[PDB]
Amino acid sequence: SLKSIIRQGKQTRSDLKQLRKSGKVPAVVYGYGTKNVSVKVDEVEFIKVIREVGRNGVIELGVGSKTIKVMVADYQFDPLKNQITHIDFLAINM
Amino acid sequence: MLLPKRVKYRRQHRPKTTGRSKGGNYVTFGEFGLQATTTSWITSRQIESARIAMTRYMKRGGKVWIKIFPHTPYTKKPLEVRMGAGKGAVEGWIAVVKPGRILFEVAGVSEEVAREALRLASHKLPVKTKFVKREE
Amino acid sequence: KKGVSSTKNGRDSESKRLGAKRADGQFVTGGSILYRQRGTKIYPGENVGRGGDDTLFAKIDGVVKFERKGRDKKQVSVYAVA
Amino acid sequence: KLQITLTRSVIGRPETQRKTVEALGLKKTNSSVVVEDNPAIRGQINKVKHLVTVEE
RNA sequence: UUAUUGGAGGUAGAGCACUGUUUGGACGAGGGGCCCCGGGUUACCGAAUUCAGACAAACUCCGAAUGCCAAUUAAUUUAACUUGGGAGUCAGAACAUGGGUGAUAAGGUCCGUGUUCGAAAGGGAAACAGCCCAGACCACCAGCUAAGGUCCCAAAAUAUAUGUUAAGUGGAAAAGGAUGUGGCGUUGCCCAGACAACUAGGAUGUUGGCUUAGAAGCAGCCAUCAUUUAAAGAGUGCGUAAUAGCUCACUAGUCGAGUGACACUGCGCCGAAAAUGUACCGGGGCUAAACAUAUUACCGAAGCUGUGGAUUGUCCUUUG
RNA sequence: CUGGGGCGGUCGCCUCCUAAAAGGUAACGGAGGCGCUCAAAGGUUCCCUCAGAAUGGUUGGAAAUCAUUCAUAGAGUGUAA
RNA sequence: UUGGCACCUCGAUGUCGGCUCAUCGCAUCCUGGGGCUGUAGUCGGUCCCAAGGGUUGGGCUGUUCGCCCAUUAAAGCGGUA
RNA sequence: CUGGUGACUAUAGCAAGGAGGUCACACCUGUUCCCAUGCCGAACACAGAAGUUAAGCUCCUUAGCGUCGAUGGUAGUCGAACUUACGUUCCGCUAGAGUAGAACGUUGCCAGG
Ligand SMILES: [Mg+2]
Ligand SMILES: [Mg+2]
Ligand SMILES: [Mg+2]
Ligand SMILES: [Mg+2]
Ligand SMILES: [Mg+2]
Ligand SMILES: [Mg+2]
Ligand SMILES: [Mg+2]
Ligand SMILES: [Mg+2]
Ligand SMILES: [Mg+2]
Ligand SMILES: [Mg+2]
Ligand SMILES: [Mg+2]
């Protein structure tokens, strides 16, 4: 239930396009106990984890040094490309 | 033949065809569906031909949902006329389809049966298509 | 050469050049038309009169300010320069 | 201070862009101007960035 | 002109709150076919309601980018306005792009916007008003560049590096069709023996039941099970009027390494028939002299620069 | 005027869409109105709030008038938008 | 082919049919070579290759067409103002 | 604290539950008078105070609805390069919807407690 992520800076349209081509997925982390953080996660790894935990399963996100348990609040998908364009992670109060 | 019972305006501007599908890009009523990968007008006749083909192969055991409806009327001038002197009479009814739009949805059959049924439907339609399933 | 029918349309009225006549933050002399409109899309504000045709006009010399007037309404006002 | 050179011609270009090139003080093709750096100048350069080369 | 700030407005997109359009679910206000003033329940459920999903130039709960109007506004630039003398013009064209019309026809037609032509020579696009580069004061057997190019025609790389293509693709076209070939993933089986081949079996109830004149595994329907297994379907096909017969699925051996499916992609293939002569690279020719991605050179104009000269402004300023 | 002319249609004015979120903008483009009306349907002062639906009630019926509740405007605004 | 458009030609680009002379394309009428066939043979059907040569005389109609008579291996379809 | 009267885009509303009454505000009691009903003292008006917090009203709780609402991403788009592709690429701007969240108001002046 753990997948590593990398933080992101301000991005141009080209950068995000390169990220998705690389196979990484742009994402944001929000919720209780966390400020909004923009993160990138590998698509394949995310898909494996979500299968293990399910759609609403709690996930351990390696947000920089800290690790935050998160849920997939929402995701954006491209039907033609069969690719997840964006993922929203909601922090869960424990 | 699917067509609107009434319209406020019988003579309408032809729809914009450039761009990607606004909605109906996900299978919501059935297990499987046919996704358009190209843009074209879809006529009421084309819908019926595709519908009849898919139902026959399915043998009516499965349920067919037709996602697209031909709302827009289109006109044609009478034959051998010069330009001008007003717009022509209504000739047909069409649905604008852009890449991503799910044309039809099928349920109550095995995938193999659905794939063949949608294949038979695809050959009746102007656009290029891809077989699609509900995504979770 | 096939014979042809005719359209029953082909008519339109003259355009009435409605809309803003003066900018927000611009000085205007008294009597200056600020906005031309049918009904009250913009309401008469401070030192601004509404004509019989719903034209908005400055009632004094001053600066034009377009202002909100509740959730879904707007008004135009004129304020005298110091 | 920035040095702006008109590397590409204003022929075939929209008039509004031509006005900006005039405003920057650029004249004939390959002409140069030396101007102080400020936001207003940068905006003019931004409008005609395709037509000019900038050196600091 | 730009920056900064304020404002008007409803387009693109989006959305369905309104007006219409529309798909699939449920669900019923109220009685009829139906079962009692004495009750019920297998249409219509049309009212309505609800959940999910779509559509709109003349729909909008929303709503940009731009453009527009301004500012005792700053930077840069050089116009602007008024009055008076003299005009010409009122057939426009292409291209790009936002639209109407036409057929998401026209080198069509009609409006918005920009550019060029018109009224513009020079270089490129073989030739080619309107495309691309660029605006010719005059002279030079000087230099640097643009678009476009660098094997020969024909000036400059037979340049460098790493791949792709085999179709002269490059150097005209579609639905659709295909063990062409390259790349990046996903997944099944496999030296406790994969895939293919070869050898052997491939059975019994049973010719399963109905149908049909006939249906025995193989015209059409219902079910699709037990038994001996080292394995067998109430049969994937060929075949018989029905049979039969052949064969397959599946299984056990021989050799031993890979073998199968799926998704996303690069570049190619077929689909592809017209009239004087090759004739859809400008030619020769090219397997790179094609294509992709980088790197460094060079060529290339009447552009820019150098030198001399002309005319007219401006500024220094008798001078020049 | 006219996608040659004739024939057909049209000619002024108003409203909308085309119109590309200022304004303006064409085609024999898509839709409709006008050549009035009102002596109050004008002015002012004061007062007032709809359509529709449900339920109850006689003549009375889906629908007349009455009553309560809900109803934010789906009403009305002389006459197109 | 019937049209759409109105771009060269109105200080002239002669217009239907026939006659004379042809010439080219191939989507092939005949003849030559094939595949498949619901191909026994003789005949056919359909498709592929193939443009070398060949592809008749009459009645009616200005006719092009078209019908008809009699043939022929066949009586091809188009372009060339 | 309460009341009168103002400001603000409902974060301010709606709904539901609860609480409160020397004064105040109502309900309320009458119609003699001012005044009133297209009938009606219902309302309006006036004269009052027996009764009552029942309701309105005020206060408290709440997030069901309505309202507000990011960040991130997406659509669209100015400009540019490339192309003619129902296009591509780069840059700036940047929604709508949805999500986290906000929110059962915040305040000015005057008179009382
Ligand atoms: Mg108008
Ligand atoms: Mg739209
Ligand atoms: Mg134009
Ligand atoms: Mg050479
Ligand atoms: Mg050089
Ligand atoms: Mg020069
Ligand atoms: Mg406008
Ligand atoms: Mg505009
Ligand atoms: Mg013309
Ligand atoms: Mg002559
Ligand atoms: Mg041939």
CATH code, B36: 3.90.1170.10
Residue B134, Cβ density class (10 Å: 0-12 exposed, 13-18 middle, ≥19 buried):
middle
Task: Indicate if CB(A85) is under 7 A from strand H.
Answer: yes
Domain assignment present for B19: no
Count the neighbouring beta carbons within 10 Å of the beta carbon of residue A38.
14
Q: Where in chain C does DSSP place strands (E)?
A: 19-20, 27-28, 33-36, 43-44, 48-50, 56-58, 62-68, 74-79
Domain assignment present for B83: yes
* Closest CB to B136 among A55, A79, A80: A55
Domain assignment present for B1: no
How many distinct structural domains can be found in chain B? 1
Count the neighbouring beta carbons within 10 Å of the beta carbon of residue C62.
20
Task: Indicate if CB(B82) is under 7 A from strand G.
Answer: yes
Enumerate domains of chain D plus CATH numbers.
Answer: 1-56 (3.30.1390.20)
Q: Which nucleotide is nearest to B41 (CA to C1')?
A: E104
Residue B121, Cβ density class (10 Å: 0-12 exposed, 13-18 middle, ≥19 buried):
buried
Domain assignment present for B47: yes
How do strand C74-79 and strand C62-68 relate by DSSP bridges? antiparallel
Q: Which residues contact C74 (CB under 8 A, 6 or more apart)?
A: C41, C42, C43, C66, C67, C68
Taking CB atoms and an 8 Å cut-off, how many pairs form between chains B and C? Answer: 15
Q: Which residues contact B32 (CB under 8 A, 6 or more apart)?
A: B105, B106, B107, B111, B114, B115, B118, B131, B132, B133, B134
Question: Quick one: how far is CA A36 from the chain centroid?
Answer: 12
CA A92 – CA A1 distance, rounded (Å):
14
Domain assignment present for B102: yes
Q: B9 — phi, psi (to 5°)?
A: -125, 120
- Looking at chain A from residue 7 to 66, which residues have their Cβ under 8 Å from any Cβ of chain B? 55
> For residue B83, which ligand has an atom nearest its CA?
9
Any idea where the domains of chain A sit in the sequence? 1-92
Task: Indicate if CB(B96) is under 7 A from strand E.
Answer: yes
DSSP conformation class of B32 = E
Domain assignment present for B5: no
CA A81 – CA B132 distance, rounded (Å):
12
The CA D7 to ligand 6 mean position distance, Å, reads 15
The CA D32 to ligand 5 mean position distance, Å, reads 22
* Closest CA–CA distance from residue A65 to any residue of chain B (Å): 31
Task: Indicate if CB(C2) is under 7 A from strand F.
Answer: no
Domain assignment present for B109: yes
CATH architecture of the domain covering A1-92 = Beta Barrel (2.40)
CB contact under 8 A, A79 and B135: yes
Instruction: List residues of C whose CB lies inside 8 A of any B CB.
Output: 1-2, 4-7, 9
Residue C38: helix, strand or coil by DSSP?
Answer: coil
Contact between A92 and A32 under an 8 Å Cβ cutoff? The reply is yes
The domain of B124 spans 24-136
Task: Indicate if CB(D14) is under 7 A from strand H.
Answer: yes
DSSP character string of A36-55:
EEEEEEEHHHHHHHHHHH-S
Q: What is the structure's resolution, reported in angstroms to one decimal?
A: 2.2
DSSP character string of D33-46:
EEE---HHHHHHHH
Q: Which nucleotide is nearest to B84 (CA to C1')?
A: F28
* Closest CB to B37 among A55, A77, A80: A80
Q: With residue A18 as reference, give the H or E element that holds it.
A: helix A13-22
Chain B residues in contact with C5 (beta carbon < 8 A):
85-86
